[PDB]
Short mmCIF file of C-alpha atoms in Angstrom, two decimals:
data_model
loop_
_atom_site.label_atom_id
_atom_site.label_comp_id
_atom_site.label_asym_id
_atom_site.label_seq_id
_atom_site.Cartn_x
_atom_site.Cartn_y
_atom_site.Cartn_z
CA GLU A 1 0.00 0.00 0.00
CA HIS A 2 1.46 3.29 -1.30
CA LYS A 3 0.85 6.26 0.99
CA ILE A 4 1.55 9.98 0.91
CA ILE A 5 0.72 12.57 3.54
CA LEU A 6 0.29 16.25 2.82
CA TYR A 7 0.58 18.91 5.53
CA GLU A 8 -0.68 22.49 5.82
CA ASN A 9 2.33 24.22 7.38
CA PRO A 10 6.06 23.58 6.89
CA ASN A 11 7.94 20.88 8.84
CA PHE A 12 4.97 18.47 8.98
CA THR A 13 2.67 20.54 11.22
CA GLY A 14 -0.95 21.65 10.86
CA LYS A 15 -4.00 19.92 9.36
CA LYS A 16 -3.27 16.90 7.13
CA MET A 17 -4.62 14.53 4.43
CA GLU A 18 -3.62 10.85 4.17
CA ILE A 19 -3.82 9.30 0.74
CA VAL A 20 -3.40 5.52 0.41
CA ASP A 21 -3.15 4.16 -3.14
CA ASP A 22 -5.94 6.27 -4.70
CA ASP A 23 -5.66 9.28 -7.08
CA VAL A 24 -7.10 12.65 -6.04
CA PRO A 25 -8.26 15.03 -8.83
CA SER A 26 -9.68 17.58 -6.40
CA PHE A 27 -8.46 18.25 -2.87
CA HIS A 28 -11.60 20.31 -2.22
CA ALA A 29 -13.80 17.35 -3.15
CA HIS A 30 -11.87 15.37 -0.52
CA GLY A 31 -12.32 18.00 2.20
CA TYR A 32 -8.89 19.64 2.02
CA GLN A 33 -9.37 23.37 1.35
CA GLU A 34 -5.92 24.50 2.59
CA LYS A 35 -2.47 25.18 1.14
CA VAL A 36 0.29 22.53 1.19
CA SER A 37 3.74 23.39 2.54
CA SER A 38 5.31 20.01 3.47
CA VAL A 39 4.97 16.48 2.10
CA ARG A 40 5.93 13.03 3.40
CA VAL A 41 6.08 10.21 0.86
CA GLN A 42 6.25 6.83 2.62
CA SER A 43 6.03 4.73 -0.52
CA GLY A 44 5.62 5.00 -4.27
CA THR A 45 6.19 7.80 -6.73
CA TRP A 46 3.61 10.58 -7.14
CA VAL A 47 3.22 13.76 -9.20
CA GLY A 48 1.46 16.65 -7.55
CA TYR A 49 -0.14 19.47 -9.54
CA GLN A 50 -0.79 23.15 -8.94
CA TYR A 51 -4.47 23.17 -10.03
CA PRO A 52 -7.31 20.56 -9.86
CA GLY A 53 -7.78 18.00 -12.64
CA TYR A 54 -3.98 17.61 -12.92
CA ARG A 55 -3.30 21.09 -14.40
CA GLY A 56 -0.61 23.69 -13.91
CA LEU A 57 2.92 23.17 -12.65
CA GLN A 58 3.93 19.53 -12.10
CA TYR A 59 6.03 18.52 -9.10
CA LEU A 60 7.59 15.06 -8.86
CA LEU A 61 7.37 13.41 -5.44
CA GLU A 62 9.55 10.35 -4.85
CA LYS A 63 9.94 8.54 -1.51
CA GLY A 64 11.22 10.88 1.19
CA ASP A 65 10.42 13.90 3.34
CA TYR A 66 9.98 17.43 2.01
CA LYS A 67 10.08 19.94 4.90
CA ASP A 68 9.34 23.04 2.86
CA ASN A 69 7.59 23.38 -0.50
CA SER A 70 10.76 24.73 -2.07
CA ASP A 71 12.01 21.15 -1.58
CA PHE A 72 9.58 19.86 -4.21
CA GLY A 73 10.08 22.76 -6.62
CA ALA A 74 6.94 24.74 -5.68
CA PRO A 75 7.13 28.59 -5.79
CA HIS A 76 4.19 28.84 -3.37
CA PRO A 77 2.18 26.36 -1.20
CA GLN A 78 -0.30 25.49 -4.01
CA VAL A 79 -1.14 21.91 -4.80
CA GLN A 80 -4.72 20.95 -5.68
CA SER A 81 -4.39 17.41 -7.11
CA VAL A 82 -2.06 14.41 -6.84
CA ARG A 83 -1.62 11.11 -8.75
CA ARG A 84 0.51 8.02 -8.43
CA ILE A 85 2.83 6.58 -11.08
CA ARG A 86 2.14 2.84 -10.90
CA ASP A 87 3.59 1.69 -14.21
CA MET A 88 7.33 1.68 -14.73
CA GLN A 89 9.19 -0.08 -17.53
CA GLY A 90 12.45 -1.99 -17.32
CA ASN A 91 15.23 -0.41 -19.36
CA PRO A 92 14.48 3.31 -19.72
CA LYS A 93 14.97 4.80 -23.19
CA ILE A 94 13.95 8.15 -24.59
CA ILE A 95 14.61 9.62 -28.01
CA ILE A 96 14.47 13.32 -28.55
CA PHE A 97 14.31 14.85 -32.04
CA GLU A 98 15.39 18.35 -33.08
CA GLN A 99 12.24 18.95 -35.06
CA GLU A 100 8.52 18.48 -34.90
CA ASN A 101 6.61 15.30 -35.62
CA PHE A 102 9.73 13.23 -35.00
CA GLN A 103 11.96 14.64 -37.76
CA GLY A 104 15.54 15.88 -37.80
CA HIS A 105 18.60 14.64 -35.91
CA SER A 106 17.78 12.19 -33.14
CA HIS A 107 19.48 11.84 -29.71
CA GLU A 108 18.81 8.67 -27.70
CA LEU A 109 19.35 8.44 -23.92
CA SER A 110 19.01 5.64 -21.33
CA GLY A 111 20.36 7.43 -18.28
CA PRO A 112 20.55 10.91 -16.67
CA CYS A 113 21.75 13.84 -18.74
CA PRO A 114 22.40 17.12 -16.87
CA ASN A 115 22.82 19.08 -20.09
CA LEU A 116 21.26 18.31 -23.49
CA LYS A 117 23.73 20.54 -25.39
CA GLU A 118 26.35 17.86 -24.76
CA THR A 119 24.53 15.52 -27.14
CA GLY A 120 24.87 18.15 -29.88
CA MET A 121 21.15 18.82 -29.45
CA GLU A 122 20.27 22.35 -30.56
CA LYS A 123 16.50 22.39 -29.86
CA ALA A 124 13.86 19.98 -28.53
CA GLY A 125 11.14 19.61 -31.17
CA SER A 126 9.49 16.28 -30.35
CA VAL A 127 10.08 13.44 -27.82
CA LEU A 128 9.52 9.70 -28.04
CA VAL A 129 9.43 7.70 -24.80
CA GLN A 130 10.01 4.00 -25.43
CA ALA A 131 10.37 3.16 -21.72
CA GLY A 132 10.18 5.22 -18.56
CA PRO A 133 8.78 7.33 -17.00
CA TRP A 134 11.33 10.10 -17.40
CA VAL A 135 11.43 13.51 -15.78
CA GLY A 136 12.60 16.55 -17.69
CA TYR A 137 13.67 19.94 -16.37
CA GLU A 138 13.52 23.43 -17.79
CA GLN A 139 17.16 24.11 -16.79
CA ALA A 140 20.51 22.32 -16.69
CA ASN A 141 21.58 20.16 -13.71
CA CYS A 142 17.98 19.12 -13.05
CA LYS A 143 16.48 22.39 -11.78
CA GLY A 144 13.55 24.63 -12.73
CA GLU A 145 10.17 23.69 -14.20
CA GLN A 146 9.43 19.95 -14.20
CA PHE A 147 7.74 17.96 -16.99
CA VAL A 148 6.89 14.24 -16.48
CA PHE A 149 7.15 12.03 -19.61
CA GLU A 150 5.37 8.70 -19.84
CA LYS A 151 5.52 5.97 -22.51
CA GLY A 152 4.06 7.60 -25.61
CA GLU A 153 4.58 10.23 -28.30
CA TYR A 154 5.12 13.96 -27.74
CA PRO A 155 4.93 15.65 -31.26
CA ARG A 156 5.23 19.33 -30.26
CA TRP A 157 6.54 21.53 -27.50
CA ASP A 158 2.99 22.04 -26.22
CA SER A 159 2.57 18.32 -25.50
CA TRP A 160 4.72 18.83 -22.41
CA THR A 161 4.44 22.61 -21.89
CA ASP A 162 9.50 25.92 -24.38
CA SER A 163 13.09 24.74 -23.60
CA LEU A 164 14.15 21.47 -21.99
CA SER A 165 17.73 21.22 -20.74
CA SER A 166 18.05 18.09 -18.56
CA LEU A 167 16.48 14.61 -18.14
CA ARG A 168 16.50 11.73 -15.63
CA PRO A 169 15.03 8.14 -15.69
CA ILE A 170 12.60 5.99 -13.70
CA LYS A 171 11.65 7.90 -10.62
CA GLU B 1 -19.26 -1.63 -13.50
CA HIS B 2 -17.60 1.22 -15.39
CA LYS B 3 -16.34 0.26 -18.83
CA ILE B 4 -15.22 2.08 -21.97
CA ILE B 5 -13.98 0.56 -25.19
CA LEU B 6 -11.75 2.37 -27.65
CA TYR B 7 -11.46 1.32 -31.29
CA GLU B 8 -8.81 1.87 -33.97
CA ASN B 9 -10.96 2.61 -37.04
CA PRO B 10 -14.34 4.41 -37.27
CA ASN B 11 -17.66 2.63 -36.65
CA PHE B 12 -16.24 0.28 -33.99
CA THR B 13 -13.89 -1.73 -36.19
CA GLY B 14 -10.20 -2.64 -35.91
CA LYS B 15 -8.02 -3.45 -32.88
CA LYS B 16 -9.50 -2.49 -29.49
CA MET B 17 -8.85 -1.88 -25.85
CA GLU B 18 -11.44 -2.35 -23.12
CA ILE B 19 -10.87 -0.42 -19.88
CA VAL B 20 -12.71 -1.48 -16.73
CA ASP B 21 -12.84 1.08 -13.87
CA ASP B 22 -9.09 1.94 -13.94
CA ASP B 23 -7.38 5.13 -15.20
CA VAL B 24 -4.86 4.93 -18.04
CA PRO B 25 -2.10 7.61 -18.15
CA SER B 26 -0.35 5.88 -21.04
CA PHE B 27 -1.94 3.86 -23.85
CA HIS B 28 1.49 2.75 -25.00
CA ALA B 29 2.28 1.34 -21.57
CA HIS B 30 -0.95 -0.62 -21.84
CA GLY B 31 -0.02 -2.04 -25.24
CA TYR B 32 -2.15 0.24 -27.42
CA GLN B 33 0.15 2.01 -29.90
CA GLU B 34 -2.58 2.95 -32.44
CA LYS B 35 -4.87 5.90 -33.17
CA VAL B 36 -8.45 6.09 -31.82
CA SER B 37 -11.35 6.86 -34.18
CA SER B 38 -14.47 5.48 -32.42
CA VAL B 39 -15.46 5.11 -28.75
CA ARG B 40 -18.19 3.13 -26.95
CA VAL B 41 -18.97 4.20 -23.37
CA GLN B 42 -21.07 1.57 -21.61
CA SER B 43 -21.05 3.20 -18.19
CA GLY B 44 -19.65 6.18 -16.34
CA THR B 45 -18.23 9.52 -17.46
CA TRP B 46 -14.68 9.76 -18.75
CA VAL B 47 -12.34 12.42 -20.03
CA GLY B 48 -9.94 11.45 -22.82
CA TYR B 49 -6.81 13.45 -23.60
CA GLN B 50 -4.72 14.08 -26.70
CA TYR B 51 -1.30 13.33 -25.12
CA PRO B 52 -0.11 10.94 -22.34
CA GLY B 53 -0.26 11.93 -18.66
CA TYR B 54 -3.54 13.79 -19.27
CA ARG B 55 -2.16 16.63 -21.47
CA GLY B 56 -3.38 18.39 -24.58
CA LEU B 57 -6.95 18.71 -25.81
CA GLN B 58 -9.63 17.32 -23.43
CA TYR B 59 -12.60 15.31 -24.71
CA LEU B 60 -15.61 14.61 -22.53
CA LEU B 61 -17.03 11.11 -22.97
CA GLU B 62 -20.43 10.42 -21.42
CA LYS B 63 -22.43 7.20 -21.83
CA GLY B 64 -23.12 6.45 -25.50
CA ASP B 65 -21.60 5.52 -28.85
CA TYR B 66 -19.26 7.75 -30.86
CA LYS B 67 -18.93 6.42 -34.44
CA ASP B 68 -16.34 8.91 -35.63
CA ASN B 69 -13.86 11.00 -33.66
CA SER B 70 -15.56 14.19 -34.78
CA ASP B 71 -18.40 12.97 -32.51
CA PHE B 72 -16.26 13.53 -29.41
CA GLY B 73 -14.74 16.82 -30.60
CA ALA B 74 -11.40 15.46 -31.80
CA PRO B 75 -9.79 17.28 -34.78
CA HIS B 76 -7.51 14.28 -35.26
CA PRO B 77 -7.92 10.70 -33.96
CA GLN B 78 -5.18 11.14 -31.37
CA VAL B 79 -6.02 10.08 -27.80
CA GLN B 80 -3.19 8.84 -25.55
CA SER B 81 -4.72 8.80 -22.03
CA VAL B 82 -8.14 8.47 -20.41
CA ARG B 83 -9.54 8.94 -16.88
CA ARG B 84 -12.90 8.46 -15.16
CA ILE B 85 -14.86 11.07 -13.26
CA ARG B 86 -16.03 9.23 -10.16
CA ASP B 87 -17.03 12.02 -7.79
CA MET B 88 -20.02 14.18 -8.63
CA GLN B 89 -21.70 16.62 -6.24
CA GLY B 90 -25.42 17.16 -5.75
CA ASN B 91 -26.56 20.64 -6.70
CA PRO B 92 -24.11 22.02 -9.28
CA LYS B 93 -23.00 25.62 -8.80
CA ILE B 94 -20.24 27.59 -10.49
CA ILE B 95 -19.30 31.21 -10.06
CA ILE B 96 -17.35 33.00 -12.73
CA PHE B 97 -15.63 36.34 -12.09
CA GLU B 98 -14.66 38.99 -14.61
CA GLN B 99 -11.04 39.43 -13.52
CA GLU B 100 -8.20 37.40 -11.97
CA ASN B 101 -7.95 36.03 -8.43
CA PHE B 102 -11.72 36.12 -7.98
CA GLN B 103 -12.25 39.86 -8.29
CA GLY B 104 -14.76 41.95 -10.24
CA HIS B 105 -18.40 41.31 -11.08
CA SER B 106 -19.54 37.78 -10.32
CA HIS B 107 -21.97 35.59 -12.32
CA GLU B 108 -23.38 32.45 -10.63
CA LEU B 109 -24.88 29.53 -12.58
CA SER B 110 -26.52 26.24 -11.58
CA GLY B 111 -27.64 25.01 -15.00
CA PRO B 112 -26.57 25.09 -18.68
CA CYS B 113 -25.76 28.42 -20.31
CA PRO B 114 -25.28 28.42 -24.11
CA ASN B 115 -23.97 32.00 -24.09
CA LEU B 116 -22.13 33.78 -21.27
CA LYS B 117 -22.73 37.25 -22.74
CA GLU B 118 -26.35 36.87 -21.62
CA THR B 119 -25.27 37.14 -17.99
CA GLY B 120 -23.69 40.50 -18.77
CA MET B 121 -20.30 38.75 -18.53
CA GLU B 122 -17.62 40.42 -20.68
CA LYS B 123 -14.47 38.36 -20.07
CA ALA B 124 -13.77 35.26 -17.94
CA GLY B 125 -10.95 36.01 -15.51
CA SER B 126 -11.29 33.37 -12.77
CA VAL B 127 -13.69 30.49 -11.97
CA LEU B 128 -14.89 29.02 -8.69
CA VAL B 129 -16.53 25.60 -8.75
CA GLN B 130 -18.58 24.96 -5.61
CA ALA B 131 -20.17 21.78 -6.97
CA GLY B 132 -19.81 19.91 -10.22
CA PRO B 133 -18.10 18.83 -12.36
CA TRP B 134 -18.94 21.34 -15.10
CA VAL B 135 -17.86 21.34 -18.73
CA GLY B 136 -16.94 24.57 -20.49
CA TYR B 137 -16.63 25.26 -24.22
CA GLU B 138 -14.61 27.80 -26.17
CA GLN B 139 -17.63 28.75 -28.31
CA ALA B 140 -21.36 29.45 -27.87
CA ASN B 141 -23.98 26.67 -28.00
CA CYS B 142 -21.56 24.13 -26.48
CA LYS B 143 -19.10 23.68 -29.36
CA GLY B 144 -15.34 24.05 -29.86
CA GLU B 145 -12.51 23.38 -27.41
CA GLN B 146 -13.59 21.60 -24.19
CA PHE B 147 -12.39 22.39 -20.64
CA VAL B 148 -13.47 20.19 -17.68
CA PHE B 149 -13.91 22.01 -14.33
CA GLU B 150 -13.85 20.16 -11.02
CA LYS B 151 -14.56 21.38 -7.48
CA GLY B 152 -11.82 23.86 -6.70
CA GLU B 153 -10.35 27.25 -7.61
CA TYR B 154 -9.25 28.46 -11.06
CA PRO B 155 -7.44 31.87 -10.53
CA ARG B 156 -6.26 32.59 -14.11
CA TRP B 157 -7.21 31.54 -17.64
CA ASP B 158 -4.13 29.32 -17.77
CA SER B 159 -5.64 27.14 -15.01
CA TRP B 160 -8.06 25.76 -17.62
CA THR B 161 -5.94 25.82 -20.78
CA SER B 162 -3.59 22.75 -20.75
CA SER B 163 -3.12 23.90 -24.26
CA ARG B 164 -2.93 27.64 -23.56
CA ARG B 165 -4.38 28.27 -27.03
CA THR B 166 -7.56 30.26 -26.23
CA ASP B 167 -8.47 32.50 -23.28
CA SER B 168 -12.20 32.73 -24.12
CA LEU B 169 -14.98 30.62 -22.61
CA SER B 170 -18.47 31.09 -24.07
CA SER B 171 -20.72 28.27 -22.78
CA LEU B 172 -21.07 25.93 -19.75
CA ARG B 173 -23.00 22.79 -18.77
CA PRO B 174 -23.38 20.83 -15.46
CA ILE B 175 -22.79 17.32 -14.12
CA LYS B 176 -21.88 15.12 -17.00
#
């Protein structure tokens, strides 16, 4: 049983919400009308979102304790929905193309990459995820805006958002 | 029990995938690497999305049969993830404000509205959903781009545009 606990104030204090296994599209529909400043992931990997219905900024939440919201990459204490990643594939592999609809020079990866320029990659047009999930970041060295990629096809920049500078495998 | 079946070619032909209760963030992970042109919803309300992980254009799917993809509002037969709406509230109520962060003139609704101009509403800045879910449309008479609204707060236009392509919202409709 995969559990996550969200707290109102930093350092695990204040009112809380315990979520075991399930996916929550609306915190308000589950009684939680407050902000979220600290998270405790006991098991499993989750992705929390800024707005309800899984919209807005994405924040990856792997096993561990996050004392402040800055720890999970959140500018402010807003999180209105959370879901669990329950399907992970064996050998991670992602192919990123320099142009739209999977055209141009391709760059395959199967492990972390702190800087995409090092692959000779000029721009990120489309992305193909053969096995993952993978987590991408707006800036180098895995920092900034997060974008979660699951097994599938991402034809344009708007399928995940424009820049993408770093990536990392199965979370 | 909640079931939906997605088909490859129009009119319910070709390879298929049946989904019972569960939520699918990735069709590819579930073995389905093809397009989707026709859908058959036997029970429950679902929301299908263009890209994996619930991104891109949203498509509401209520009980019924959709022979072609144009029937569910899909420009192209691309659907890579689907989820079920399993929590609906009693008396639907939505309040839409004319500016951001819930400021300005408010306009409350509890039933369908084919045209928001009729409420004296000029622009849609923020949305508060007290009970739903509600489905919004980019054009009048419930047509165009779809946006699903669940119980919560929507401060800016970008809170309802996963594809930040259009800031207008012209019609709304209750519990699907």
